[PDB]
Each structure stands twice: as structure tokens, then as C-alpha cells.
């Protein structure tokens, strides 16, 4: 039969916004396929049907990324880094939608395919972070070792992708979007663990593996798994501030090179300016 040519691509551009539909059979997360029909024996035989099988995989990841969204903060901020990035993906979506509603449009199947092509590479590196992210959720006893090895694979992904590229810093910032935001609740417990003396660790999952023991003679026991000296400076300081609350006393990217271990070696004196000033008070 005849389906609408140059309008089914505006109707997949439809699907990519509102993700569950009837022109495209994305029934589940594992299988996302499209079937329109075979179209007629003149005027674009099968090329357009080959292009729809490509974008079937590109609506597949956004259905996977939305299925990851449900309604620690580290697992929630890693989820909101996905969603805060979506409005930068949804702004172009309204641009090409504004172009085709405005007559004349002067676009077709193929001349739009290079406009979303820089976005096409940006959405596939989104797939690699989240596919290497969740791999041990159907296994049980995930709690801290899943958090530790998905932060590890996030760090494994930023070593593989930023350090090899650097011709475009727009994706260099993008892999830093996924890093600086997940580490921020993993930071704000450390701020609470020093200047307030107490920390928050939930019971269903676990984080940095700091826990206070219930007896008074026991100080602090580090959980065994079943920069690191700067983390030991957090351990002794939060022990010492737990003591102190018990005591009653009285431009261009290529010149900025590169990138995340320089910012981390800025955070360690930021830890340091409290690790150096606590031990003076002890």
C-alpha cells in the first residue's frame, strides 16, 4: 500500500517526542522495530524503508533512557543528568518541527539526515554510558558494589572518550555533565560528615562505606567490599569532628588540557583546606 512519503519521516519525528505509538512497534525495551509497508514501484522503492530501519535503533535508546526514569541521591542525580540533558535534545526537535510546519519547507528525507547527525553521535555515547551503567541490577545484593562499579565504568567511559577526541569540546563538556553532577551528592555527604560531624547512609543501599559503630569505645569501622589518600583524610577528619561534637571545649579548550584530573587535583586542596584546618584545631 501507499503510505505518506516525506511525511512518515515527520511522523517518526513525531514518535521521537511522545514515545509510545502505533506507526512504530516499540512494544518493549529489548525490541524496537518499525513496519510501515512496501511502497510503490516508482519514486523511492526501498531506500526510505532502509532509513526507517536505521532510526528504529535511534528511537530505541530514548525508549531505554525513559524506561530508566522512575518516580541514594547519587542514583537520582545520575538519573537527573539524563533528564537535564534532554531539554537540549528537545530544543532542536522543535526547530525542525517549526521548519516543516512553515511553508515552504525545502527539506526532504535525506537533507534532514545530516542535521541530526551531530546529534546522532551524541545520542549513541548516551547509550554507552547507561548500557555499561546498568548490568548488575537483575543480579541481587547490588547495593554498594553496583554503585562503585557504575561510577567506575562512568570513569572508564570518560577516559576512553574525552582523551581520544578533543577536536570538539561540545561533547567534552557532555561527558563532564555526567560526571560533575553524580559526584555532587557524593560530595555533600562529605561536607556534612565534617562541619556537622554526622553522616547519612541509607539501609537498603550503601555509599562511600563510612559507618559509625554503636559503642562509645569503638570509633569507626570501614566496610569491606564483598584520590584514595585524600579519602583517608576525610576518614580521620570526620572521626575527629565526631570527637569534637562529643568534647565540650571552652577561554580555549586546547590550552585547558585535559581535563578531569586537573579539576580533581583542584578538589583535593578544597578537601585539603579543611583537612589542614581541622588538624590545627584538634
Amino acid at each position: 500500500t501507499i503510505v505518506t512519503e516525506t511525511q512518515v519521516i515527520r511522523e517518526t519525528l513525531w514518535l521521537l517526542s511522545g514515545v509510545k505509538k502505533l506507526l512504530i512497534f516499540q512494544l518493549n525495551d529489548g525490541k524496537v522495530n518499525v513496519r510501515n509497508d512496501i511502497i510503490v514501484t516508482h519514486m523511492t522503492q526501498n531506500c526510505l524503508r532502509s532509513v526507517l530501519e536505521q532510526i528504529a535503533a535511534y528511537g530505541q535508546v530514548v525508549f531505554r533512557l525513559q524506561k530508566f526514569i522512575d518516580e541514594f541521591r547519587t542514583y537520582q542525580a545520575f538519573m537527573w543528568a539524563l533528564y537535564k540533558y534532554f531539554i537540549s535534545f528537545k530544543e532542536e526537535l522543535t526547530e525542525i518541527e517549526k521548519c516543516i510546519i512553515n511553508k515552504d519547507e525545502t527539506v526532504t528525507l535525506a537533507i534532514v539526515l545530516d542535521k541530526l547527525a551531530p546529534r546522532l553521535a551524541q545520542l549513541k555515547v548516551l547509550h554507552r554510558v547507561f548500557s555499561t551503567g546498568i548490568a548488575e541490577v537483575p543480579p541481587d545484593t547490588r547495593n554498594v558494589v553496583r554503585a562503585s562499579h557504575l561510577l567506575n565504568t562512568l570513569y572508564k567511559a570518560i577516559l576512553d572518550y574525552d582523551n581520544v577526541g578533543e577536536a570538539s569540546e561540545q561533547t567534552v563538556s557532555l561527558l563532564f555533565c555526567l560526571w560533575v553532577e553524580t559526584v555532587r551528592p557524593y560530595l555533600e555527604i562529605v561536607d556534612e560528615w565534617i562541619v556537622h560531624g554526622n553522616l547519612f547512609d541509607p539501609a537498603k543501599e550503601f555509599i562511600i562505606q563510612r559507618n559509625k559503630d554503636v559503642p562509645f569505645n569503638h570509633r569507626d569501622f570501614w566496610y569491606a567490599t564483598y584520590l584514595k589518600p585524600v579519602l583517608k583524610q576525610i576518614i580521620m577528619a570526620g572521626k575527629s569532628m565526631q570527637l569534637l561534637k562529643n568534647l565540650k571545649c571552652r577561554s580555549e579548550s586546547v590550552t585547558c588540557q585535559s581535563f578531569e584530573l586537573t579539576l580533581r587535583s583542584c578538589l583535593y586542596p578544597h578537601i585539603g583546606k579543611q583537612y589542614l584546618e581541622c588538624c590545627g584545631n584538634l
Binding site: 560533575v180 590550552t255 583542584c266
Partner: peptide
């Protein structure tokens, strides 16, 4: 001082 350490990191990125 949570985002403040990251704000100085982004300030050091523009000055690097």
C-alpha cells in the same frame, strides 16, 4: 560548599 568547590573548578577551567 558543595557546588562551591565545583564553581571554583569551572572558574579554573576558564583560567587554565
Amino acid at each position: 560548599a558543595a557546588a562551591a568547590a565545583a564553581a571554583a573548578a569551572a572558574a579554573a577551567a576558564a583560567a587554565a
